[model samples]
Target: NSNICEVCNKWGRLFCCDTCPRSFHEHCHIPSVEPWSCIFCRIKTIQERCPESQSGHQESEVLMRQMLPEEQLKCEFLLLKVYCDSKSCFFASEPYYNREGSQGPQKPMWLNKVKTSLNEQMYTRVEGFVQDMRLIFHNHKEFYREDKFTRLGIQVQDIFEKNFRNIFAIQETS
Candidate 1:
């Protein structure tokens, strides 16, 4: 019934599959999706929201129990590990053009975008979106062999080190 959106002409906002992706909008997706929610992410959210889907009940019921365990578990979760050498899956992340982003007390830049969209205020305790994404990597501290260019990849402790020392760290937790 729709190509992009009911309003924006697919020009803005990421709604609830409200417009879906294509038959949609983009020149460069100009603003880019921060935290990058993709199809993989969308599917995960649906599974999380509908807990029954995780029980494998609806799955077997779909076939009315004609299929066996192997076939059932085979398509259980279509998720794939896309992390590795690919540029999209590059080890390091959170890059900006001008300055290294940080958080103070000011409304986070990301939250500011949401504020503009909502007709009313969104939150009182809005931590705002500002942050240096360091906590995510603290879990994995080990060897990361990226072949020839050993010093830098995606994972790291500081800005320079690239190993499992919790200093020049690498190896992200799965």
Candidate 2:
């Protein structure tokens, strides 16, 4: 009598090892030739065959700067805006910061869509994105910090609160 598979805990179609008393599901075991070995005894067929999964060796780590949710969204937005602007067939504009309140180019309708197709996976760091736009428009790089980041975050949050009066503002006023 043999035990259940090590990978998946079920008893159905099983392969047995010749050298040792080991059993595994047909879906679970590695390929065998003359001396059939279970999962524990030999390297998996997948580990050798599949490059996408990277089974044999350790995968390297990726280093990236982090950003807050809104800042990240802005990075994504800027990247999308740049890409979309290059694509003439697509209508790619709006949903940008309204510098016009401080008198920007296109003020009222600037901050448009929070979620755009371009913003999905464009940036790892949000402040970098803001700085990129600032450099492009303002001609200088203002280094970001956690403390200074809050003021802009508050400004962005206030704009959201400016619109979200029904949720809390009216309740407070009433």
Candidate 3:
């Protein structure tokens, strides 16, 4: 019997065990899909490309080191957590407290509020990312000059800075 793809609503496909209880085209499974795809496949891919492990979590260490450059200027901070969200940005679960000693997360309500204000005043948060990209390119021009690394760095830096600024702005506003 033929089954329908939950994403495209097309018939004749394989079952998606990890995602919804629906079928998907082989092409969709092979390349891409909408809504969602097999969670098992995603996990498998991540496992296959796992980064080299360290005694301590490498990504988190790198992020912390990067943010506190004054303290880490001499040491090389290995890339750690992906800066897609505030939680990931912090990496560690330790609570961040203000000078007042009021216990709260580093990225609390005030930061988010600030970000909202900036977005309203600036018209778009996208510009922050662009600026960050420019800064990264300018800072790392030597490293990227060897090949397409510069362009690739520019692209990745843009993505990271944009997301980072948005999150940081929001946290500050909150």
Candidate 4:
């Protein structure tokens, strides 16, 4: 049956899964999912094309290295996908903690700030990009612990990491 994509929540011509009621935008799902089985229903580990194992400190070392100009597309896509999942609920705008007249985050960060940094090409390495992404969730959890908004931050973080692994082709680690 045709319906809105589960992840993107937009009405469109979507790929339907034979095993479930879910539908997805062609590019929204990951790892070459077949029509008979969406990524959620797959039985395999879903790391078939990780290319090479870049887990452990090796991955960190790789991320800490300089980013090539060609890597811009991958970084930009990561941001786009994050925004897609977040839907601007809490991530799209800056936090309003300062209005309370209390101490604010010492290392505050937001999605818009990340986008601006990326657009301005302020990131000298992939780590900078990744760090900003992580900081958004990290700051949320620090303020609210396990509140719903913080939980959503964690959810978005997982989505970002999944896409990050795929984009960077970082091998799966058990």
lDDT of each: 0.27, 0.35, 0.35, 0.69
lDDT of 1 by residue, 124-161 (tens): 21121001112222212112233343333343324212
lDDT at residue 70 of model 2 (Cα atoms): 34
Report the Cα lDDT for candidate 4: 0.69
As a whole number from 0 to 100, the lDDT of residue 28 in candidate 1 is 18
- Give the per-residue lDDT digits (tens) of candidate 2, residues 1-174: 277654345677767776567666653342222266543343234334544433221111111336554334323323333322222112123423333223333222222122232244444553333343433322111212233432443444343333223211123332
Among the numbered candidates, top TM-score falls to: 4
What are the per-residue Cα lDDT tens digits for candidate 3 across 1-174? 236654345676465544446455644342223435453344334435653311233233334433232212111101111222233222222223343423333232222232333334432333332343344335343433455544644554555554443322322322
Q: Which pairs of residues collide in candidate 1?
A: 91-154, 92-154, 108-128, 108-129, 163-168, 163-169
Candidate 2 residue runs with Cα over 4 Å from true position? 31-34, 43-174
Winner by lDDT: 4
lDDT of residue 170 for candidate 3: 25
| Decoy 3 TM-score against native | 0.22
Q: Can you write out model 4's per-residue Cα lDDT over 67-95, one digit (the tens) per residue?
A: 67545546766776686673435876788
